[PDB]
Design an enzyme around this catalytic site. Sequence first.
Site, mmCIF file in Angstrom:
data_model
loop_
_atom_site.group_PDB
_atom_site.id
_atom_site.type_symbol
_atom_site.label_atom_id
_atom_site.label_comp_id
_atom_site.label_asym_id
_atom_site.label_seq_id
_atom_site.Cartn_x
_atom_site.Cartn_y
_atom_site.Cartn_z
ATOM 1 N N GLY B 10 38.424 22.197 21.096
ATOM 2 C CA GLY B 10 37.434 21.702 20.151
ATOM 3 C C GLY B 10 37.331 20.193 20.240
ATOM 4 O O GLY B 10 38.094 19.553 20.964
ATOM 5 N N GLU B 71 31.024 24.042 22.719
ATOM 6 C CA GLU B 71 29.797 23.291 22.963
ATOM 7 C C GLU B 71 30.121 22.196 23.968
ATOM 8 O O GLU B 71 31.252 21.717 24.002
ATOM 9 C CB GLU B 71 29.228 22.708 21.666
ATOM 10 C CG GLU B 71 30.074 21.605 21.040
ATOM 11 C CD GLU B 71 29.354 20.272 21.029
ATOM 12 O OE1 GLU B 71 29.773 19.356 20.291
ATOM 13 O OE2 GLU B 71 28.358 20.144 21.759
ATOM 14 N N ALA B 99 31.144 26.946 17.086
ATOM 15 C CA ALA B 99 31.564 27.867 16.035
ATOM 16 C C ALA B 99 30.976 27.466 14.677
ATOM 17 O O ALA B 99 31.264 28.093 13.662
ATOM 18 C CB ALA B 99 33.110 27.936 15.974
ATOM 19 N N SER B 140 42.068 20.522 15.843
ATOM 20 C CA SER B 140 41.882 20.292 14.417
ATOM 21 C C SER B 140 42.065 21.586 13.622
ATOM 22 O O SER B 140 41.841 22.678 14.143
ATOM 23 C CB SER B 140 40.471 19.720 14.139
ATOM 24 O OG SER B 140 39.457 20.708 14.337
ATOM 25 N N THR B 145 35.958 25.808 16.172
ATOM 26 C CA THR B 145 36.599 26.034 17.449
ATOM 27 C C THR B 145 38.087 25.685 17.398
ATOM 28 O O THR B 145 38.941 26.474 17.857
ATOM 29 C CB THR B 145 35.914 25.221 18.559
ATOM 30 O OG1 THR B 145 34.529 25.600 18.641
ATOM 31 C CG2 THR B 145 36.584 25.483 19.902
ATOM 32 N N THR B 179 33.825 17.019 8.046
ATOM 33 C CA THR B 179 32.429 17.363 8.320
ATOM 34 C C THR B 179 32.014 18.736 7.792
ATOM 35 O O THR B 179 30.878 19.179 8.011
ATOM 36 C CB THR B 179 32.150 17.305 9.834
ATOM 37 O OG1 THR B 179 33.230 17.931 10.547
ATOM 38 C CG2 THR B 179 32.051 15.862 10.288
ATOM 39 N N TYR B 224 36.569 7.498 14.870
ATOM 40 C CA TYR B 224 37.430 8.437 15.583
ATOM 41 C C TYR B 224 38.163 7.706 16.725
ATOM 42 O O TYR B 224 39.344 7.951 17.008
ATOM 43 C CB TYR B 224 36.606 9.618 16.129
ATOM 44 C CG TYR B 224 36.234 10.706 15.123
ATOM 45 C CD1 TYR B 224 37.151 11.156 14.178
ATOM 46 C CD2 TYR B 224 34.965 11.290 15.136
ATOM 47 C CE1 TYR B 224 36.816 12.147 13.263
ATOM 48 C CE2 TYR B 224 34.615 12.284 14.221
ATOM 49 C CZ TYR B 224 35.550 12.711 13.286
ATOM 50 O OH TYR B 224 35.225 13.693 12.373
ATOM 51 N N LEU B 252 60.846 21.331 26.306
ATOM 52 C CA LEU B 252 60.163 21.855 25.122
ATOM 53 C C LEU B 252 61.089 22.562 24.132
ATOM 54 O O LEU B 252 60.957 22.397 22.915
ATOM 55 C CB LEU B 252 59.048 22.813 25.545
ATOM 56 C CG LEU B 252 57.856 22.132 26.208
ATOM 57 C CD1 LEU B 252 56.670 23.104 26.304
ATOM 58 C CD2 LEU B 252 57.483 20.850 25.448
ATOM 59 N N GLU B 254 64.098 22.008 23.424
ATOM 60 C CA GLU B 254 64.982 21.093 22.699
ATOM 61 C C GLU B 254 64.326 20.547 21.438
ATOM 62 O O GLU B 254 65.028 20.091 20.525
ATOM 63 C CB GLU B 254 65.413 19.936 23.596
ATOM 64 C CG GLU B 254 66.667 19.233 23.125
ATOM 65 C CD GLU B 254 67.239 18.305 24.179
ATOM 66 O OE1 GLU B 254 67.037 18.586 25.384
ATOM 67 O OE2 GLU B 254 67.881 17.296 23.799
HETATM 68 N N1 LIG Z 1 41.416 12.293 14.213
HETATM 69 C C1 LIG Z 1 40.336 12.910 14.643
HETATM 70 N N2 LIG Z 1 39.789 13.914 13.880
HETATM 71 C C2 LIG Z 1 38.685 14.555 14.326
HETATM 72 C C3 LIG Z 1 38.084 14.210 15.538
HETATM 73 N N3 LIG Z 1 37.006 15.011 15.701
HETATM 74 C C4 LIG Z 1 36.899 15.837 14.630
HETATM 75 N N4 LIG Z 1 37.942 15.557 13.772
HETATM 76 C C5 LIG Z 1 38.265 16.238 12.511
HETATM 77 O O1 LIG Z 1 38.305 17.635 12.823
HETATM 78 C C6 LIG Z 1 37.588 18.376 11.854
HETATM 79 C C7 LIG Z 1 36.311 18.897 12.489
HETATM 80 O O2 LIG Z 1 36.588 19.857 13.471
HETATM 81 P P1 LIG Z 1 36.155 19.652 15.001
HETATM 82 O O3 LIG Z 1 37.323 19.530 15.928
HETATM 83 O O4 LIG Z 1 35.307 18.425 15.124
HETATM 84 O O5 LIG Z 1 35.318 21.005 15.214
HETATM 85 P P2 LIG Z 1 35.456 21.948 16.496
HETATM 86 O O6 LIG Z 1 36.906 22.238 16.843
HETATM 87 O O7 LIG Z 1 34.739 21.342 17.664
HETATM 88 O O8 LIG Z 1 34.726 23.320 16.061
HETATM 89 P P3 LIG Z 1 33.121 23.531 15.960
HETATM 90 O O9 LIG Z 1 32.320 22.279 16.185
HETATM 91 O O10 LIG Z 1 32.825 24.145 14.618
HETATM 92 O O11 LIG Z 1 32.752 24.535 17.012
HETATM 93 C C8 LIG Z 1 37.243 17.393 10.744
HETATM 94 O O12 LIG Z 1 38.318 17.438 9.830
HETATM 95 C C9 LIG Z 1 37.166 16.066 11.485
HETATM 96 O O13 LIG Z 1 37.357 14.902 10.713
HETATM 97 C C10 LIG Z 1 38.643 13.188 16.312
HETATM 98 O O14 LIG Z 1 38.162 12.837 17.388
HETATM 99 N N5 LIG Z 1 39.771 12.550 15.855
HETATM 100 MG MG LIG Z 2 32.527 19.958 19.431
#
Ligand SMILES: Nc1nc2c(ncn2[C@@H]2O[C@H](COP(=O)(O)OP(=O)(O)OP(=O)(O)O)[C@@H](O)[C@H]2O)c(=O)[nH]1
Ligand SMILES: [Mg+2]
EC number: 3.6.5.-
Lengths: 54, 439, 428, 331
Positions: B10, B71, B99, B140, B145, B179, B224, B252, B254
Amino acid sequence: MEVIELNKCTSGQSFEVILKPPSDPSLEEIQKKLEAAEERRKYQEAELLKHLAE
Amino acid sequence: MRECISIHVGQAGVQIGNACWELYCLEHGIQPDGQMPSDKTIGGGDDSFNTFFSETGAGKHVPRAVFVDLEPTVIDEVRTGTYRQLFHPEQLITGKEDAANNYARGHYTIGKEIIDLVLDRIRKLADQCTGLQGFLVFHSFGGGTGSGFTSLLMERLSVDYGKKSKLEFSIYPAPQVSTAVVEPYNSILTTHTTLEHSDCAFMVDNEAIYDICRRNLDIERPTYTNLNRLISQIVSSITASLRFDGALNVDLTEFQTNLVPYPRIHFPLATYAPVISAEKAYHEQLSVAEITNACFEPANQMVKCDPRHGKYMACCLLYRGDVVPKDVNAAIATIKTKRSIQFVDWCPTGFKVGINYQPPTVVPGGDLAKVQRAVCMLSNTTAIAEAWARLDHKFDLMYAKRAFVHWYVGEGMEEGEFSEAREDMAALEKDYEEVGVDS
Amino acid sequence: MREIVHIQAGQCGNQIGAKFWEVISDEHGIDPTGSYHGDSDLQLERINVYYNEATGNKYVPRAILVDLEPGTMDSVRSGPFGQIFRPDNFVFGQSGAGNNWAKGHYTEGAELVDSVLDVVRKESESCDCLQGFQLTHSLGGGTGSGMGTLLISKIREEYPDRIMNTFSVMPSPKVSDTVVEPYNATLSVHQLVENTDETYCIDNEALYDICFRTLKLTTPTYGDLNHLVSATMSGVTTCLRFPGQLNADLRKLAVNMVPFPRLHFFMPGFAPLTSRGSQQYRALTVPELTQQMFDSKNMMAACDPRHGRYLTVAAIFRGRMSMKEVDEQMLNVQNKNSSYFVEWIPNNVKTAVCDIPPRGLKMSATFIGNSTAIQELFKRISEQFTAMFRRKAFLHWYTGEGMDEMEFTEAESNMNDLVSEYQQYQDA
Amino acid sequence: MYTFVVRDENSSVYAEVSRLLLATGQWKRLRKDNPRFNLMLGERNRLPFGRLGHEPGLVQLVNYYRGADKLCRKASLVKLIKTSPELSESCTWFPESYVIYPTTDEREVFLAAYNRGNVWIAGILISSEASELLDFIDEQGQVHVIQKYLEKPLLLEPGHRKFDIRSWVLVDHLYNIYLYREGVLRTSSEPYNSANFQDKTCHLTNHCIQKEYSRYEEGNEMFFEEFNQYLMDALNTTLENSILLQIKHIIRSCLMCIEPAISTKHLHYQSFQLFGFDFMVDEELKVWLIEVNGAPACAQKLYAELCQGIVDVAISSVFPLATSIFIKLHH
Ligand SMILES: Nc1nc2c(ncn2[C@@H]2O[C@H](COP(=O)(O)OP(=O)(O)OP(=O)(O)O)[C@@H](O)[C@H]2O)c(=O)[nH]1
Ligand SMILES: [Mg+2]
Ligand SMILES: CC[C@]1(O)C[C@@H]2CN(CCc3c([nH]c4ccccc34)[C@@](C(=O)OC)(c3cc4c(cc3OC)N(C)[C@H]3[C@@](O)(C(=O)OC)[C@H](OC(C)=O)[C@]5(CC)C=CCN6CC[C@]43[C@@H]65)C2)C1
Ligand SMILES: Nc1nc2c(ncn2[C@@H]2O[C@H](COP(=O)(O)OP(=O)(O)O)[C@@H](O)[C@H]2O)c(=O)[nH]1
Ligand SMILES: [Ca+2]
Ligand SMILES: [Mg+2]
């Protein structure tokens, strides 16, 4: 208090310092859950296309 | 020598992965085109760094990593980034639609159309290993995803690699950069489903990183990119012992041995110091005592919580730079009197310590100042359960009205997986409670 | 590329449709002939969400124009951006619908609907990853209303897994005087409740108040009203058309805005409120933007938000401005009026910023609210409906087209169910 | 406009405090589980401290110190005084005490210093013969603690009657320790019997138990005005010299002992708390600590002033609005 297991090298060192002593599912079963969820998703759409047919 | 494979899932997982891999290259002297002049054995090796990079006969050192997102946008950046030559196309996997912040869509609906491809790519890297130790998985909690696909993958990995270790780096949701209102749902669902499959997971609350960035880096509105450069420093500190010569946390397994006595309680608190602004016209350089003491400040934790009101089951100190054991041992006895640090009875009050002389590498033009010495503490404290309490209360508020539930059920999930997942977390909160109650 | 297909139906649908395409064409640096003439590559980055690209490097709106009379279709053709639309995407009849939902939905409409669907299918089979559809129409007339909702039911049947989104203009006796409009509106709301994922309620009652009371337009025209509609439509689609992290596609927006399937009718809001030609001198502060966008006087639906509670909110700020101050000012609104946001949906307000401002403005803000207060809109229509229906007045216009009155009883029931369901959550 | 919530409706003190806040016109009360509050007047038990301080744009403050229970449970206080080096077994001002479980404790070493003036206290009961009381606890299901009952209390005249002193202390978010200049003597109304002890009448001083099984002063409550006058007329000393200095000392010691464990100095939310310390004065004008209450009630005459002082020092210092009644104990 007590230092133990001191490992050194040209990169650095490691050791432990003690201050005090004490006082799963198969590939088969996973398919079965995914297929089932997809079954409900398909049933749900069927009902809908059906309502739109009326 | 034994290899590790990193899996970035993701958007969060992928962008963090790029930060880490960029930082790994600068630490090992691997250029953007994959060439590593320092490496004198061409086309092969069993050096410590070979655990993360394989090699080609052309001298290319390429990461043992796979990137997966439903995506294409984010991974496309990687495909065209400054380290585009580092990776080969087969380890960068994407879909068409994502997703939509919906765990059910990531797990069931869109996941099933891509899981066997991902596993086949992972198989390819694995076969190139002489002694695979397991996986580091970046994602995340909040994305569709990151939550849904990941827990799918984790389960399949236990089936196809029953004896390998699986470590997690998990981004925990914060409103300030989140988001979807539905992130607590996704967080509890994936935690429930991934729990038995993960040996050790490092949780990072975006809230904690956001504020360290605001307060210590003078970043008014952290992006980010800001968050991720800081996160890769912590990740790097944690994985340094796998990529460098040493004797602590060298494999790993350990990590679990040193940090995780109880399988389900496998969430170590990371604390990092020091974080200093590069725009700062010189900062009086901090001592071993000072950066060690900072490890017991909530404000430098990857998760805001209060370890005073919990107990420790294990504690590791990882130093980079100008550090020798004597100053460390002398920093500890001082702290042990100043602070209330309570291990559980069935546990020695003690620290496993690791020093790497190479001081922290910083990204050029980044926000972080170079420092002669730094430390990352990994402490398995019951206090981290505070973040489960927070998450679960938000879940309960929405779930009681069934708010948003139809989006998951419409994807083929049953309401029952919600309650089951919450019940598991209720049990997990009680386990932490048992373990930390002298008072 | 995650394409959207745009459909506009009937007189109102095509007039606000055309102005939408004119406004966003300008924002993306596209001209009347379909040529790019913009600075930022920021304009071209998600350009394919709304535009098709051909050779000749032309951009053609993914837009279908539908009506049962030729009138407004000719009007669009001679209009400023008349030439950008695909000619084969003009689909029209000769009969008209006589402000009669039954004609739009069952008789005249049925005759035209299939040729509309052929053009939809052409546009859809062309998409790499189709997001779904958006429709502009009014609910008070016959074509946008009756045929508009027929199209939605048929499109959903061919594409049950795509998002359906509408911009739906609600009738008001402040603006029009055709006595059957509450009939057409109620019949259509019943449809919209069952068949759309998101509906923007654009209330001619609120558009009238803003124009007449706030902007001091003593002879307001549909041109004036539509100035507000196009500004709002540019605003609510900003996150679809420019690089961004939040509500960046129709489904993610629906997942953030729709806690219950039926409760998907949004109150849009916009600030600053301006008349056409009313030149902007002082750009608002971030504070001003925020207070205004939440003010009842800036809502495009004639509902008092203080009379209900917000389930979900999206806020979109545009222009160069402090992201820190935007965060600070948005927290302030929630922290200061926290009883108006339901407590059982945590962090239910989401904020986006886009550096590109809209034409004529240095600073703008667009509000999208899912408020239980929208029940006032449906209550208003409902009283109007029942005042006539209890005497069966004007029903012969509909029964003459083959409808039974039982179908009226049901639409009325469904809309009153919807109102009480909002009322459930307002208390909770 | 500051916001607050109420999660303890039973508290009389913070009833008044909320009254005082709403009357200012710069505070408003929210629904109990509305998260967007500045101030939490929290429940007495299982307060969710873990959920405080995670609201962006809100400075949050709560009227309790997490971990202060260690001072406000009898078992915990004995444990804290015996194992804390700041207080030490060399603690001149706390009565000899042992924690005992009804059959990690010390039921044994209790009898050990026994068979060496032997009168002790344990829904309570006193005795000199240990063997019996150890059954009293055995019957009951809670961890009971036992300490030497004070043989020779300071007895007021006229009446030959014993009492206890309650002092109210406020600790703010900066961990300044504030002693309310007004305390109260909760007096026994009926005379003191040294003979057979097991009569819960003239030995127990607590208020409610004297509105029952029991003239001189109103409500068996004597204030500092009165008691200071008495000390000057019968013992030729002042309240300040012979007593308050010892009380100010004990308060300092206890709360400085736990500061490292409960301070909210570098924390993401802030705490303050109101404690009720209870003391005993003996024949030699020596002062003893009996208990520390974490959720104290206030004397009726004083509510207005004390609750006012709480808003001034604890709440409004964090949340400003548009001599002093406390004694700052320095450290
Ligand atoms: N620290 C950090 N948090 C992130 C980043 N990108 C997204 N997030 C956090 O992750 C969550 C959003 O999920 P994403 O990882 O962006 O979504 P995804 O896994 O791509 O899943 P979908 O887009 O729904 O298919 C939110 O809480 C965001 O603030 C990043 O680059 N760094
Ligand atoms: Mg994405
Ligand atoms: C934005 C579209 C719009 O132009 C808005 C109004 C109406 N129409 C058509 C143009 C129009 C208007 N007035 C006209 C008179 C004759 C011929 C045409 C018109 C229009 C205007 O600009 O006035 C200066 C207008 C019309 C109305 C209008 C306001 C208005 O412009 C200010 N109304 C508020 C109603 C109206 O019913 C009303 O005032 O409600 C109590 C109003 O009644 C009275 C007593 O004035 C009136 C006036 C003709 C009478 C009967 C029913 N209709 C329904 C709408 C209402 C009107 C403006 C479309
Ligand atoms: N805001 C707005 N409303 C319109 C416009 N044209 C018509 N309407 C309204 O739409 C309703 C009339 O429906 P109309 O679109 O003309 O009928 P149709 O052609 O059969 O779909 C009434 O409520 C009119 O006030 C317009 O350009 N803008
Ligand atoms: Ca090599
Ligand atoms: Mg018309």
